[PDB]
Symmetry: none
Subunit: 75 residues, 6 copies
């Protein structure tokens, strides 16, 4: 006679914690900002950001891939 | 006689925590912002952002993929 | 005689928490913003944003894909 | 007999063409951003041409004439 | 017998073409950003041309004329 | 017998072409950023051409003329 018990158990965690997690920002102060501009010429694309206080979080990553395969073959 | 008991168990977690999670911002202050501009020429695309206080969160990521194959073959 | 019991069990979790979750913003203050412009020329597309206080959350991500396959083959 | 046959069938399908001046041009969004002239006096006398922020398209065509002369003669 | 046959069948499919001046050009967003003239006086006299921030397209075509002369003669 | 056959069938498919002046050009976003002239006086007299931040396209074509002369003669 033949008996096969196939009882694998998975309690695993796969976790990503990406970016700005659990931070404390107590009374942050951005200074006064002045941008005085005159007599400028731009021949191509301009990207401009002006400001006193920025919090920027960018997360292209932190993705998870889990692949699992179970094969039982008898004869 | 043959007996097969295929009873795999999965309690697993796959998780993404991506971006700005659980932060405290207490009285954040952006300063005064002045942008004085005169006599400017732009020949191509302009993107402009002006402001005192910004919170920006961008998440292209944090995606999960799970794949799970079960095969039992007898004879 | 042959007996096959096929009883795989899935209690697994796949989760995305993407963007701005569970944050505290206590009395955020944007400053005064002034944008003074005269005698400007733009030959191509302009995108402009002006303001004192921004909260911006953008989530192209945080997607979940789950694939599960069960094959039982006898003879 | 000593017969004579003359067939005079010249054929003209030719083209004479003049394309003179400003033809088939594209002017897409022409013009300056800001033009400013600041004075206490503008004093213009005796054959002055002044252009301030103007757009001018000027075409003069004294030419582009076509002359075609054709002569046919059959003498027996 | 001592006969004569003449078959006079010249063919002209020729083209004479002039393309003279400003043809098929693209002007896409021409013009300066800012032009400023500051004075207390502008004093222009006796054959002055002044251009301040203007755009001019000027085409003069005294030429581009076509002359075609064709002559055919058959004498028997 | 002593007959005579003449077949006169010249064929002209020729092209005579002049392409004279400003043809097929692309002018994409031409113009300066800032032009400033600051004075107390501009004083222009007696055959002055002044250009301040202007764009000029000027095409003169006295030429580009075509002359085609063709003569055909058959004498028996």
């Amino acid at each position: 006679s033949v008996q096969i018990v196939y009882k694998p158990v998975d309690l695993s965690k796969v976790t990503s914690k990406c970016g700005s997690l659990g931070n404390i920002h107590h009374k942050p102060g951005g200074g006064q900002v002045e941008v005085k501009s005159e007599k400028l010429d731009f021949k191509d694309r301009v990207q401009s950001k002006i400001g006193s206080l920025d919090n920027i979080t960018h997360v292209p990553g932190g993705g998870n891939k889990k692949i699992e395969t179970h094969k039982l073959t008898f004869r």
